[PDB]
Structures are given as C-alpha cells and as structure tokens.
TrEMBL record, chain C:
Organism of provenance: Chaetomium thermophilum (strain DSM 1495 / CBS 144.50 / IMI 039719) (Thermochaetoides thermophila)
Organism domain of life: Eukaryota
Domain Pre-mRNA-splicing factor Syf1-like N-terminal HAT-repeats: 1-98
Protein localization: Nucleus
Family: Belongs to the crooked-neck family.
Protein role: Involved in pre-mRNA splicing and cell cycle progression. Required for the spliceosome assembly and initiation of the DNA replication.
Subunit annotation: Associated with the spliceosome.
Name of the featured protein: Pre-mRNA splicing protein
TrEMBL record, chain D:
Record-annotated Myb-like domain positions: 1-49, 50-93
Organism: Chaetomium thermophilum (strain DSM 1495 / CBS 144.50 / IMI 039719)
Segment of the intact protein contained: 4 to 96 of 768
Phylogenetic placement of the source organism: Eukaryota, Fungi, Dikarya, Ascomycota, Pezizomycotina
Superkingdom of this protein's organism: Eukaryota
Name of this chain's protein: Putative pre-mRNA splicing protein
Domain HTH myb-type per the UniProt entry, residue ranges: 1-53, 54-93
Automatic annotation (TrEMBL), chain E:
Subcellular location: Nucleus
Upper classification of the organism: Eukaryota, Fungi, Dikarya, Ascomycota, Pezizomycotina
The name this protein goes by in its record: Pre-mRNA-splicing factor SYF1
Function of the protein: Involved in pre-mRNA splicing and cell cycle progression.
Family indicated by similarity: Belongs to the crooked-neck family.
Automatic annotation (TrEMBL), chain I:
Chain positions with Phosphoserine modification: 1
Function: Involved in pre-mRNA splicing.
Family to which this protein belongs: Belongs to the SNW family.
Quaternary data: Associated with the spliceosome.
Cellular compartments annotated: Nucleus
Protein's organism: Chaetomium thermophilum (strain DSM 1495 / CBS 144.50 / IMI 039719)
Name listed for the protein in its UniProt record: Pre-mRNA-processing protein 45
RNA sequence: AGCUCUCUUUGCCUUUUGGCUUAGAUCAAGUGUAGUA
C-alpha cells in the first residue's frame, strides 16, 4: 500500500497571520535581557596581534605545565605465572571511533549480558 | 496410480498460472 | 510556479501552444523560457528552429544574435554559421567566425 | 499431519513462495505448505534448495580437504562444512 | 570443451592416455569428463547439443 | 511518438522464456532487474538452470 | 537433505488444494483498503 | 549535491531504499555490498548507517541503565531494549566466532 | 556557468541499481531468485 | 566524408548530456527541413530592399 | 496441451519449452541451407524477370 | 526460436570471453641451458 | 550516396517496488465410517 509514505516535499514555513488578537499563546517570561558587566568580559576588543600574542602565551604556558619544566606449597600447580602483563593495561586511555568495539561497549555488554 | 508423473511441475508454471487467471454525452450538462 | 527551471515543462507548454497555432503566445513563451534559462541549449535551439520554420529569417537572426550575446558553446556558433551558409550571406558568416 | 518427506510439489511451491516473500519470512512460506513448519521450510532451503549447494559427485581434492579437516576438528561438522564447500549433512554422509 | 559436442578431442585425450598414462590418470580423466558433462547440463547447451546431433544426421 | 509507444507496448507484450512475474509492473521491474544484474548473477543463473553448484 | 520425490500420476486432494491456494496467494498483491477502493471505484462507476 | 550536473536524476529515491536495506543489514549482521552501486553513493550510505547505528547504540545504553534502576515502568521500553541488546550480543558473538 | 561536458562513461558511472530487499516487498512482487540472492555477500565471503 | 559522418553518428547514439541531444535533434530537424527555397528568399530580400528604401 | 504447460519439467530435469525449442531449432538447422538456396534462386529468377521485361520494352521501342 | 537462441548464444559467447581460468603450465623438468647442451652435443655428434 | 515501407542491431526504461520500530507483534487442530444383503 501507499498509505504509509516518505516525505519528499517537507512542509514550508508560513508568515504569521495578520489577524485580531484574542488567543493567548506565549506567557511572558525572562523579559529582561542581561548584559555582560565589566568583569564578565566580551565588551572589550583590543586588537588582533595582541590577541594572537596572548593566545600563543597561553598555549606555551599549558605546554610548559604539561612538560613540567619551570616442600614449596605451590609446586604441584600445573601453570605458573599466568598474569604477567595483564595489569599493564592503562598506558594511555585511547578513543576508538567504533561504539561496537569501544571499551565502553565491552564493559557494558559484559556487565549486563550474564 | 503412484507411479511418477511424466510431467513434473515447476514454480514458473505456478507463476504462469497465477498470471493467466489474474460513454456518450447527450447535452452540455452531462459534459 | 512549482517547477520554474524545468526544461521539459517549458517545452511541453511551448509545444502545446504551437500545436494550436497560437504563434504570438508561443513566442512570448519562448522569450520567457530563454530569459529564465539562458544556458539551456535546447530552448534556444527550439526558438531558432521555430523562427526558421515560420519563414522569419530576420527573426531567426535576431534570436541567434541574442544567443551569441550569451556566449554559448561551439555547436551554437556552428549552427548560426550553417544558417548563414544555407542562405548565402557569406560575409555575415565571416563576421560570425570573427 | 504436520510431517513427512519433501515432495516435488512442496519444493516448487517453496521456491515460488521464497521468490515472492524472500528468505526472512518463513511463516508466510510455511503457510503455503500444508505439512511443513517454518523451521522445516527454512531447513529445506538451507540444506537442499540453496543455489550454492553442490549436488555433483565429489572430487578427490574435496575428499582430501574433508578428511584433513575431520581429523583437525573432531565431530565439529558445522565448522567443517563452510570450509569444505558443502553442507554439514553432505560432509557427514 | 563439451563431451557431447566435441567427442574427437576426448578421443584424442584417451589416445594420449593409453599411449602415455596409467589407471590413476585414466580415472582422473573420467572424473574430469563426468564433472564437465555435469557442468554443461544447462538448457541452452542441451539445445545446442540436440541441434548439432540432429544436424549431423 | 504514438507509433513508438504502441510498438513498445506490443513488443513488451510478447513473452519469451519463463514467467517470473505476476502483473505488468512486476514484469517491467523484473526486466529492469535483468538488464542491470545479469552481468553479476550469471553463476547463480546457471546454478538454477543446472540443478547444482554455482 | 534428500532429493524431492517425484509427483504421482493422480495427486491428493491435499496437493490439489495446496496448488489452488498457491496460485491464489501468488497472484495476490493488495491489502484490504486497496481492494476496497478498487471495488468502490467499480461500484461508483456502475451507480453513475 | 554530489551527483554531477547533467546526470539523469530520475531515480534517486532508490538510494533511500538502499539506505533502508543497509540499515537492516547492519542490524542483522549481514554484510551489505550491492553489486554495481557506485562508490560515492555507497560512501554516503555507509556514513549515515554508521551515524544511525551510533544513535541506536547510545539509546540502548541509556534505556538499559534506566531499566536497571527501575526508573521506567513502560513495557514497550523494556521489550525494545531486550531486542536491541539481543542483537548487540549476537553481533559480538558472531565477531567472537 | 556553461554546462559540464559529460560522457557515456560518466552516465554509466552514476547508474543506481534497482533495489531488491531481503525483507520488504510493498507491491507483492515476485522477484527472480537470482536477483534476490544478488546482494547477499555471505555466500561470497571468505572462509579460512 | 560520408563514412566518417556515419561513424560519428554511430558513436554518438549513447546519451551524454542534454546539450548534445539538443544539438543532434536540431541538426536532424534542419536536415529534414530540406534545402531552402533560395528564390523565395531572394524575392523577399528584394522586397525588403524596396521597402527599406521606401522608409 | 504442452504449449500451455511448457514451462514444467521432465523426469531427467529438462523443461518442455527447452525440448520443444531444441526440436524446432534442429529442424531449422536442417532446413536453413536449402531455404537460403531457394531464396537466392528466387531473387535470381526475379532479376531475370526484370531483365526480360526491360528487353521487351527496348525491343518495343526499337521496332516501333 | 532460432533468432531467440541466436541472442542467447551471443550472450553465452559474451560470457565465454571471461570464464577462462588461465592455463597454469607446470614448470618443465628440463631448462633451456640443458636444451642447449643437447643441441651442442648433437652438433658435435653430427659434425663428427 | 535519394525518398517511402519492412526487418535487424544500438540507444532509450518511457505503468520500471514512496517512511518508521521490539524481522513492529503473533499464528496447532473438527469428524471420514462401512461382518452380513
């Protein structure tokens, strides 16, 4: 059947109706605009090269901060030392762009599907 | 007679059989 | 209105008014069509062909002049030259090669 | 009766039903057939009627592969069957 | 090659096998003949086979 | 153009080979499918025409 | 896993019935509303 | 926007049907590779099937947390969520095999 | 700007295959089983 | 010239774009129009001489 | 009756349309060379009929 | 029927130019250096 | 070396599948006899 259909021509916006007002639609709320006070920044433009210098100084400061520069009881046991290198996970937390193979999905699906 | 038939049906025979069994104006007012 | 730049619709409306001998109507349509869609070669071809089949060789020349104003592809200049070679004004075809 | 062996009528009706409904609606296909369930129709397509199934006599190369794999993976026939190139019942028999 | 349309080539292969071959290679040639004959059992190849069979008579 | 339309209708009205459709839209779609996909599904086609391996 | 048994000379009532149903359901394309709208179109033409 | 100029654009909702089938093949872990579908169109379809899939998986994670906590009482949410995690488990298990 | 000079190679390069669904059939079509099994990559997958 | 023309016609039957089909259709229509009546054209041109030298 | 149900199969696995086409094509391969003969002599005799008509007209114009 | 089969065999011939598994010839048990050895030994014999 | 008609091949696709989700969900079924006439 073709009762159930896609959209190939989505609905188009209309201008407002130029009619007499009787209907109530939007109750007033937050009718006062806040402005950036002195100290809240924004209302001060200095130049371009000063901004570039400040940006590069902040980047150099962050890189400086990151760098830091100013009978034995276990002898009949069949297998010994099976857990070397297992605790070494956590060298650097790494992002994989696959939500089916990310570590979050594996943790989630091992927690829940028991 | 449970001997095998000389002709055996195919699905295209089913599809073929499915296919096989599938004003004057007097005045201006009628126009 | 719904499909302004559709060449098939334009040709259908022009031919629907040409089959009923509404020549002035269809020439208005063709001017509007090649005004709306100046880089569609089919509309220009249809306008030059309609003007040549009606016997108005100066009309065909003025339509070709507007098209050449629009700087078309090679086939349009070739068609204009073949027109002037068909009718024998070889100096005019020389100007068109210039 | 909801059982039996597959006849030619049922195989042709199954193939036409699969042509109309596809390989993911076995309940419609099984509604066409009076004696067969959706699982039996699915098993008949997967084990017999699939056009990737080789019904010719075996080669010696396939025999060598089959015996080699049956020695590798004992009684793991559904594992061996994709590697050999036939179905599991074909390799078993 | 088709066995039921090109029999002379298979006759030449059997002649080469009886001059140079064994029972194992002969069984291999039977196996290849049966496999190829089974492969060419299409409708169009059956039509061609019957067409040439009634054409040579 | 009307003669071309009638000739196309008459040519497609003639059937040749097996019937794999149930109405005329299905026949047109199946012929379009053939025109695009025969060059990719030859082996499956002969698997049906043969009764065995691809 | 066995090849299909060939068809007998005389088929059962089960077999002939399932062939009749197979033809009927193979020829089918429409749901309820489409069939009803086609029947309504024919009926409205008859009434007109 | 990625079709060239002058190509006959008569059949382009066909791509949307391809996207629908590609999504269904993603859910059922069936590989999707249409013979003869161009690489640009295939790239668009694969890109948006990845995006839809990520939205699906995130919604499954969120509803599973809410079902664990008892924050929801609707039966439809639980049924949808068990269906999604059944599919996700079977995808992971096919990968494991 | 003047229209792009296409070739028949480009027109063939932008042909969109007719889609054959493994799940859907809103017109109740009977599709050949060759075309239904055309986009199933599972048979053409590798095993090793 | 005729054989090169017909090889060009054979090679230009697959669709490239609508500009080329417009070109082909126009050339076919002009060819099917026939050779022009140049005597009628010369008569009309002479009448245009006499009218344009009357205005 | 085999025209209507010609898409069914035999016991071996051959379609009735296939064997009917095979028989018809075998007959055509038997009969095709003699048809291309009889058409070549047919057009040949038509050509001599033309040459006889034109020798008749030229002798009619030469004798008056 | 003949013309339809002619079209079918044209398509079969189109298939026939692509299904060719290439002839993987075995390595010969003798190499061309030993062939040249046989050539010059036979030349020595015939010259003697 | 033309123009008509006819046929073939090439082009063309021209009635040529119009969304979604937990494949949206689910799906066993009346009775079939009959020593003797």
């Amino acid at each position: 059947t073709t009762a159930h259909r896609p959209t190939f021509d989505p609905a188009r916006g209309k201008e407002a109706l130029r009619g007499p007002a009787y209907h109530q639609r939007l109750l007033p709320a937050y009718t006062t605009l806040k402005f950036r006070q002195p100290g809240q920044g924004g209302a001060a433009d200095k130049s371009t090269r000063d901004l570039r210098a400040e940006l590069e100084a902040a980047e150099a400061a962050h890189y400086a901060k990151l760098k830091g520069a100013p009978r034995r009881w276990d002898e009949d046991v069949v297998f010994k030392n099976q857990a070397r290198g297992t605790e070494d996970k956590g060298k650097r937390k790494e992002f994989v762009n696959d939500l089916l193979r990310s570590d979050f999905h594996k943790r989630f699906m091992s927690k829940y599907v028991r | 007679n449970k001997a095998p038939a000389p002709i055996q049906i195919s699905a295209e025979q089913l599809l073929r059989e499915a296919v096989d069994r599938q004003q004057r104006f007097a005045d201006l007012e009628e126009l | 209105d719904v499909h302004p730049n559709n060449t098939q619709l334009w040709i259908r409306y022009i031919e629907a008014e040409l089959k009923n001998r509404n020549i002035n109507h269809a020439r208005n349509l063709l001017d509007r069509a090649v005004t709306r869609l100046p880089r569609v070669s089919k509309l220009w071809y249809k306008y030059v062909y309609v003007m040549e089949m009606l016997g108005d060789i100066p009309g065909t020349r003025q339509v070709f002049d507007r098209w050449m104003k629009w700087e078309p592809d090679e086939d349009a200049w070739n068609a204009y030259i073949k027109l002037e070679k068909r009718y024998g004004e070889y100096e005019r075809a020389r100007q068109i090669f210039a | 009766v909801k059982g039996g062996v597959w006849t030619n009528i049922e195989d042709e009706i199954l193939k036409a039903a699969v042509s109309k409904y596809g390989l993911n609606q076995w309940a419609r296909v099984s509604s066409l057939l009076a004696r067969k369930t959706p699982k039996q129709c699915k098993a008949r397509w997967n084990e017999w009627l699939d056009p990737s199934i080789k019904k010719i006599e075996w080669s010696r190369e396939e025999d060598e592969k089959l015996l080699h794999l049956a020695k590798l993976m004992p009684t793991q026939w559904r594992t061996i069957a994709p590697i050999v190139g036939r179905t599991a019942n074909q390799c078993l028999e | 090659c088709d066995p039921r349309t090109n029999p002379e080539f298979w006759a030449k292969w059997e002649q080469f096998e009886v001059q140079h071959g064994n029972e194992d290679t002969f069984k291999e040639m039977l196996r290849v003949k049966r496999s190829v004959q089974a492969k060419y059992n299409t409708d169009v190849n059956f039509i061609a086979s019957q067409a040439l069979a009634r054409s040579q008579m | 153009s009307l003669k071309r339309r009638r000739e196309k209708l008459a040519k497609s009205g003639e059937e040749h080979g097996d019937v794999t459709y149930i109405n005329e839209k299905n026949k047109q779609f199946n012929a379009k499918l053939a025109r695009f996909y025969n060059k990719y599904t030859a082996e499956i086609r002969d698997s049906f025409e043969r009764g065995t391996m691809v | 896993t066995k090849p299909a048994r060939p068809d007998t000379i005389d088929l059962d009532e089960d077999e002939k019935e399932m062939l009749s149903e197979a033809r009927a359901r193979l020829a089918n394309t429409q749901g309820k509303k489409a069939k009803r709208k086609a029947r309504e179109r024919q009926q409205e033409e008859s009434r007109r | 926007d990625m079709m060239p100029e002058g190509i006959k654009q008569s059949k382009v909702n066909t791509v949307l049907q391809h996207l629908s089938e590609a999504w269904r093949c993603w859910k059922s872990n069936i590989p999707w590779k249409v013979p003869g579908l161009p690489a640009p169109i295939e790239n668009i379809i694969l890109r948006y099937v990845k995006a839809k899939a990520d939205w699906w998986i995130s919604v499954a994670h969120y509803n599973r947390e809410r079902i664990r906590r008892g924050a929801t009482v609707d039966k439809t949410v639980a049924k949808k969520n068990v269906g999604r995690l059944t599919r996700l488990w079977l995808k992971a298990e096919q990968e494991r095999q | 700007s003047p229209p792009r000079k296409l070739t028949a190679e480009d027109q063939e390069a932008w042909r969109i295959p007719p889609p054959v669904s493994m799940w859907k059939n809103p017109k109740g079509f009977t599709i050949p089983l060759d075309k239904r099994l055309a986009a199933d990559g599972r048979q053409l997958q590798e095993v090793q | 010239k005729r054989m090169k023309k017909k090889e060009a016609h054979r090679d230009d039957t697959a669709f490239r774009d609508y500009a080329r089909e417009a070109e082909k259709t126009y050339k076919r229509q002009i060819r099917n129009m026939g050779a022009p009546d140049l005597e009628k054209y010369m008569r009309e041109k002479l009448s245009a001489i006499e009218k344009a030298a009357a205005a | 009756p085999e025209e209507e149900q010609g898409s069914s199969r035999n016991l071996d696995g051959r379609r009735l349309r296939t064997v009917t086409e095979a028989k018809a094509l075998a007959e055509y391969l038997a009969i095709k060379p003699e048809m291309e003969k009889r058409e070549k002599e047919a057009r040949r005799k038509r050509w001599q009929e033309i040459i006889e008509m034109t020798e008749r007209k030229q002798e009619e114009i030469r004798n008056g | 029927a003949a013309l339809k089969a002619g079209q079918m065999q044209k398509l079969r011939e189109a298939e026939q130019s692509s299904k060719r598994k290439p002839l993987i010839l075995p390595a010969p048990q003798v190499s061309d250096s030993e062939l040249d050895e046989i050539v010059k030994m036979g030349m020595i014999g015939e010259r003697a």
